[PDB]
Amino acid sequence: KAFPVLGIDYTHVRTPFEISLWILLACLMKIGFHVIPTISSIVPESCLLIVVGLLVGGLIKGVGETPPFLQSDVFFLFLLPPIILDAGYFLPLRQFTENLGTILIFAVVGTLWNAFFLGGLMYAVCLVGGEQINNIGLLDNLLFGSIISAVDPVAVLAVFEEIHINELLHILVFGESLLNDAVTVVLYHLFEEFANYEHVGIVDIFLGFLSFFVVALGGVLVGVVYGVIAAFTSRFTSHIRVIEPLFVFLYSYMAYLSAELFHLSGIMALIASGVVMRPYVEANISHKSHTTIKYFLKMWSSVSETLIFIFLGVSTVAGSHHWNWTFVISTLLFCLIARVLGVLGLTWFINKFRIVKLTPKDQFIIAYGGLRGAIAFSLGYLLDKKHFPMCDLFLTAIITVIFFTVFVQGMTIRPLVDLL
Amino acid sequence: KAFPVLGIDYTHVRTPFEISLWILLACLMKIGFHVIPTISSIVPESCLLIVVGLLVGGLIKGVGETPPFLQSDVFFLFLLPPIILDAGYFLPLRQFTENLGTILIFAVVGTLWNAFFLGGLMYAVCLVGGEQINNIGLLDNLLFGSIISAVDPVAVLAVFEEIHINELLHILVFGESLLNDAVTVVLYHLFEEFANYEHVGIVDIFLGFLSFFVVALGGVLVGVVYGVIAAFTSRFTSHIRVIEPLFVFLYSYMAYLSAELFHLSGIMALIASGVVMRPYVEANISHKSHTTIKYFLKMWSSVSETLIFIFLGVSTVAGSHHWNWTFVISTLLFCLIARVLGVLGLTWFINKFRIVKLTPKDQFIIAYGGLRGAIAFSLGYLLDKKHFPMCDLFLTAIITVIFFTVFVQGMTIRPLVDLL
């Protein structure tokens, strides 16, 4: 062997190199996405992430080598908590606790309505059209309804500006997105656990409801415990001003992992820890350290969302698909109808309770404009084949819903709202 | 199964939870290390990291479960480039290119001298005392000499202050540490490759020398290419001010990985990329983005060094040891003598070339005070057992050298320098 050390060893650096290449491509085309005169306020960033994922998936398909995949743990352990922490750390408490009732009712009850309505009506149409979807079942369909109700409405706010977005609408969609991402994951775990055993009774359903509430609240309690501990430690960190962000991220991640240890709601725990610590930091912390906390949250969340959408593109271009016309058309039309009905009913019921009525403007913004992405795909994609034999059909439906609700309900929300 | 979702599943979150627990313990005891009236300027941070690693190793030994380990790739791919980027990104060019000759000669020639002198003299004493080290060999001993010459003198600067540290001494120890960490890894790969085949000739030695230079310079060239590309892209990133740090880190890491792809010097490539980009960033970048670049470099380097030293503590408490009195005493005394002789000779030879003589002050600071750590241990620890059957003895010697040169040559450097 001439030239002793020199080599061409590529298998050594394949995961880090390709991951860095994907992130670099996404960021490069993101800075190529803002220089365009007016596209930043015409399409959401979600469209850009879809397009980047499509390009990378096309590249991988052209190369022909094995497509990468999330190993059902990298997601829940390293890609979800960044997104959740970026969202929940910048939650404005003054205008959150001011209307916690409305945000809570929308997030929880609207997600439960959307999930159960989609699951039930998808199951009903599965009973109708058969021979490819005839054998779906209920508990296998409520899971699809829950993982397709993981809506992300805050992505649409990049299309609007200071007007058309009240104080109330912004925090409302913020809380909907955040607590919806929590509740959909809790429901995902609940239904995935029920799917195993075929003997489900009234007692089992009651225990499932009880366990839903126990999971959510136990996550919350773990969050408060770790947030209080983080506040106490941040009050003792004047001397070394470089590790303060590291304490914030470490305590949030440990709250998430301690919740996930008991199968409690890690998302709720992380949100609670961030919310509880926020006021108690920024008062004991340098302004530079606060700024770098914000910057690292933004950057790390952007990287996680980018990687998830890259996997979405790889799965949609270089994946197996089970297009069924009835199921896909039914799920699109029924997710839209369920969202609209839920929003209308909930606004009608709460406007009999609040001093400031939710205007039809914001009702339309919430109903038509709630767009999936980056959690719905990931939650549906980690469904194994050992259970849920129609998980390929579930991915096809979820990908179709994501594409339709990001490229149509998100790109054509700004003009229809002027047509009020 | 009552309580459907509730569980106690710990194997799911074991690596992330224990890693976060270690980092939290280290940072907590770091902030407990600065509040002490005067210990920050009495001992280096290296001593604190050794103590944290010892405590965590004792905890793991008490628990009794399997000790974690670096899989020979996590180090070179995720723990080395953080340290190297923190060091080389803050390299002051004005006072680096001003005396590049002296820094370069110290780093390269002094490391080569230290490595070859230690290897040869360790081999000579191995020929003398036997029955446990009688069968070591030369090429198996030059590798130990190289991996024990990975000195980190900048750790001692935390013990001094604005006086006793000239303009020249600071940049000199900085460059020594940085380019020494590069050269020792290049030599590690060279000797690890030679160790395989037992038929080494004059042609092979010449080719090894040639390949050493080719590896170093090819790393440098990859570094300049990626640094120029990073500068060009940073000049086009005014619009989105949140991804600028992400471009910096992405381009540095891609330079490192592209160098490691060809087995070139990844450390040299990363240093070159950072140096080449630095002036061309901070002129096209927001001040906040520059500050967060600095903060993330510091924090991520601190985390990597902490994890490496935690592994050091785990290996020294919960590892297998092959204490040999002659080898250990010989390596301590000979590493000290080699360092002193190399420093004295090189300063004598270059003070006949420079206008500003290197004073005996800084000669003593460099010679006695060059302390190993966080690279020497890791480089020695990734030695397999399939080759190098005495790698246990090599770890024992390296750990002993680290402890002695951090707790003795680093803790008792500040008083002996007053005794000038």
Residue numbers in the entry:
A (entry chain B), B (entry chain A): 87 to 506
According to the publication:
Sodium/proton exchanger 1 (NHE1) is an electroneutral secondary active transporter present on the plasma membrane of most mammalian cells and plays critical roles in regulating intracellular pH and volume homeostasis. Calcineurin B-homologous protein 1 (CHP1) is an obligate binding partner that promotes NHE1 biosynthetic maturation, cell surface expression and pH-sensitivity. We find that NHE1 assembles as a symmetrical homodimer, with each subunit undergoing an elevator-like conformational change during cation exchange. Each monomer is made up of a dimerization domain (TMs 1−3 and 7−10) and a core domain (TMs 4−6 and 11−13).
